[PDB]
From a paper:
In this work, we employed an approach to disentangle noncovalent and hydrogen-bonding electric field changes during the reaction cascade of a multidomain protein, i.e., the phytochrome Agp2. Agp2 originates from Agrobacterium fabrum and carries a biliverdin (BV) chromophore. Phytochromes harbor a methine-bridged tetrapyrrole chromophore as a light-sensing unit, which upon light absorption undergoes a photoisomerization at the terminal methine bridge followed by a cascade of structural relaxations.18−21 This reaction sequence interconverts the parent states Pr and Pfr and involves proton translocation, which has been shown to be a prerequisite for the functional secondary structure transition of the tongue, a phytochrome-specific peptide segment. In the present work, we have generated two further variants with ortho-cyanophenylalanine (oCNF) at positions 165 or 192.
Residue numbers in the entry:
A (entry chain B): 6 to 53, 55 to 79, 86 to 97, 99 to 229, 232 to 503
B (entry chain A): 7 to 80, 86 to 95, 97 to 119, 127 to 503
Write the structure that this text describes.
Amino acid sequence: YHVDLTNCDREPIHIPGYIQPHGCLIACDNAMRMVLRHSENCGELLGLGDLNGRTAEDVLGKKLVHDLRNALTRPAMLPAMETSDRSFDISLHRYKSTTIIEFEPSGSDAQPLGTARKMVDRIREADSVESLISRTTRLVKATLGYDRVMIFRFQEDGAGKVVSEAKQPELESFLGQYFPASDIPQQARALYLKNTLRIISDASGTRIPVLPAVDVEPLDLSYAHLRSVSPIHCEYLRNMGVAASMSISVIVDGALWGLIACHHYSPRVLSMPVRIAAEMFGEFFSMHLQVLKQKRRLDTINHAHAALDRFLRLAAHHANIEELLVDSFQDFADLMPCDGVGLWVGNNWHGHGATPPHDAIPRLARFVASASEGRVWATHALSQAIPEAEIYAGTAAGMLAIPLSQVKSDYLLFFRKEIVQNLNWAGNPEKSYETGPMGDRLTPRKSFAIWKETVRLQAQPWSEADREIAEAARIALVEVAFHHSEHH
Amino acid sequence: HVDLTNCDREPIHIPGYIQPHGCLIACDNAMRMVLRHSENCGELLGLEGDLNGRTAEDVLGKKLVHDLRNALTVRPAMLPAMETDGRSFDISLHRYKSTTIIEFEPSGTARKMVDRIREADSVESLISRTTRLVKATLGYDRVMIFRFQEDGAGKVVSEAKQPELESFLGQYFPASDIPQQARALYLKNTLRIISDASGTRIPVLPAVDVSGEPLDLSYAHLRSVSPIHCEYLRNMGVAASMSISVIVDGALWGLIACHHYSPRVLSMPVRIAAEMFGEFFSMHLQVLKQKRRLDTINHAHAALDRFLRLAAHHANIEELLVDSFQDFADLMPCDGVGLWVGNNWHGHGATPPHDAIPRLARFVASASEGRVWATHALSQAIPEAEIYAGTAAGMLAIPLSQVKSDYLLFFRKEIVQNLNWAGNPEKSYETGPMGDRLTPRKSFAIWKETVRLQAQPWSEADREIAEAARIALVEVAFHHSEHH
Ligand SMILES: *C/C=C1/C(=C/C2=NC(=C\c3[nH]c(/C=C4/NC(=O)C(C=C)=C4C)c(C)c3CCC(=O)O)/C(CCC(=O)O)=C2C)NC(=O)[C@H]1C
Ligand SMILES: *C/C=C1/C(=C/C2=NC(=C\c3[nH]c(/C=C4/NC(=O)C(C=C)=C4C)c(C)c3CCC(=O)O)/C(CCC(=O)O)=C2C)NC(=O)[C@H]1C
Ligand SMILES: [Cl-]
Ligand SMILES: [Cl-]
């Protein structure tokens, strides 16, 4: 009946009963024969009496309904459609056996293909994920004219990290900030996956009711670009000073990688033709990112194999493998991202970088021995496995253990610091936010504080690539040990 | 003069002629002056006299030269339905070797073709349907795909044809049937057009300029065809062709080859659609090929992990391998596998005889540095291997020890033994002056001779799977000693 902080995790944001006022909406039966529903502003916007029950040809003219019926062969995006009286940008789709027609007054626009080609040409030569992600916020802001453009990337736990930002010089920075998974509820994530673009013209605009809200059953606006916005998010945006937004969904391995989020501090909406271009840019961006990400993964795997092969050849001419490992173990830190590495062999410890103290190591080795079946064991939350590890979480909150034997509890141990310790936040800790009725929950400062609490005593998770490199290292050492036993 | 003795280095990029389905003007780098023109420019464009030493503005007019200069500030630019006298020409424009080349032909599809391949979810399904679709859409008598082999031979892997034509499906041609300069131009250009294999070539005037420079037609679509290739097509009864280059990992994977038994050239708009289809085909093939490779590697890892878990509760690893070795044949394509341990042989499928294994095991022990050793030409390494080439022409050897010459051996048959050729051995061909050489029958016979006593090469993927198997066995052996 009324959304608040206790139920916003389940708000039915796909059936709000309202649209935003920058266009009007007509809902027809699946044949587009009769008008079933309309937004209240259809009269004003299109120049029409009482719309429900009239035929589509009566309301819109036979010529337009004919062209629209043809188009029904993603919603169809049809700029500069000639109405019976003027030009309208029309979005047309069928869902839940309902035809939804969305109208915006047409302006003067370039062909979307040409706008998109200009943008795509300025990222297509990026040859690292870093270079693509940093340039894209600057390019999008320059092309679309928003006050702020950010990219955020979803973390393994569903949190967002802001990884790129272009902004007006007077704004606060969010670069290197995180927000908790709960800042974007599951239904919003489902709709970001389904729709390339999400448009908010005015976070404080009066909603326009869909007549009727409930029929003789609510209207499913999942694919309607005019669909109204959650009061919770509108309040969040108002607290930030944001009045408008457009997000471009980033799809990698068929899932929602993150968003290109465009924010404006005054009501703002892009023409349909520029939105078509943005959608084409989004598709290209996603594919180029996926290709760069794959090449980065391949290069990091090949780097590890090259290093471990050098180690195999080195060890072949060494009578004392323990001594070689005591002299060499620091070099293994270069296989994967870590803040420390150590060697635990025959109840003797050797450490490099950020590691637990020497006295803490026996408890860690005993735990891994009990917990693993002679393969790699890794956690990003040590205190959860070993309460005692809380004391040294600042230095080492995460551990990946590579067994050196199936008959002795000897390990190569990799460590990561508590994630808050490696923050590179460009933001202003003295920047404060106004609130509304829901209070300070709906502010970036509180979002960030909630995130910090969700990852307290935790490190950056060990990725599938980190685990693949650990397995390669485990195997290379089995091989060093076996050939050593063969030849001695 | 080209013949079979020098066609391997024919300078086909500077032939001094064009095909008759358009005309060509060569200007300086700034498109100021006409330097060369095809002899048919007068007839096609309604121009009189020697065009050389006339300004581009004179010959083309102020509007066209302005438009072409603008197109130049941007692959060759394709400008369909340009206004000349108010006539319409499809214009191709490019710059190469400080020369502007302008090509003229008297004057939707891509989305429809791409939509019919985009849902293919195997390389087999994509390449099977593509010949059918291209034939139906572009209206050629035959459409084939061939894929280049590691030695540069072509294998015909897909075919759509008129029911009255002979089949080339499963046929190979040797690397020499496509010379190195032809391969370079197939890599550089998405499309290669032959409007008429019996068309009279049109000279470029002059062929060699006052400075002694030929005109480099590397990027010109009207570039004329080697007399060697025209004779080959005339022997087949082919009169016209268009190829779409297939690019995988930035290299020439093969061609989509469209053949017509009468003259044929597609309009520039349809060619632009075919090029867009070719780019999509290449990217979709690359994606499907990667997926197949990943699935094959993961399949091998899953099997080897099952072998590792199985081995952990076995006291006698030699016995488990004697009982299990035949399953290792499922890791990579092979016709046979066997286990050579403590000088005892266990074989499955097509292998050399019992008597032959010591010599092979001896050779690998001497040849390898304790890692995987593989050849597809056993007789080259070991002359007496010729005797059993029919059964086993290729061998991949996985060491089971660095102190004992114990091996897991994989074998492949002589490649001619695994042939699946759909052609007619009684179909014969007319020949011209160069003779028998320029016929599909002779090309196939030459290929067979180049691969005699050889198997299918062990791929980079086969070798990665062999390395995984070598390592899994090291792990079995080590954990066994750890607990025994
Ligand atoms: C219980 C429900 C809540 C909720 C719902 C919604 N959030 C939606 C969008 C959204 N929210 C944010 C969060 C931010 N946290 C920050 O710290 C921060 C900036 C510093 C932001 C912007 C983000 C990032 C987004 C994504 C859109 C964008 O990036 O612009 C949302 C959907 C809105 C829509 O219909 O378009 C809903 C619903 N937000 C909460 O905080 C809670 C409590
Ligand atoms: C010494 C030079 C030779 C030579 C030159 C050229 N070949 C070119 C193209 C070409 N040749 C073939 C060969 C085939 N072998 C078959 O068995 C067979 C059919 C069953 C064919 C068609 C192929 C496949 C091609 C590629 C084009 C296509 O697939 O249609 C060539 C380039 C021509 C150009 O400029 O377009 C040159 C030059 N061919 C020889 O046989 C030798 C001796
Ligand atoms: Cl507005
Ligand atoms: Cl990434």
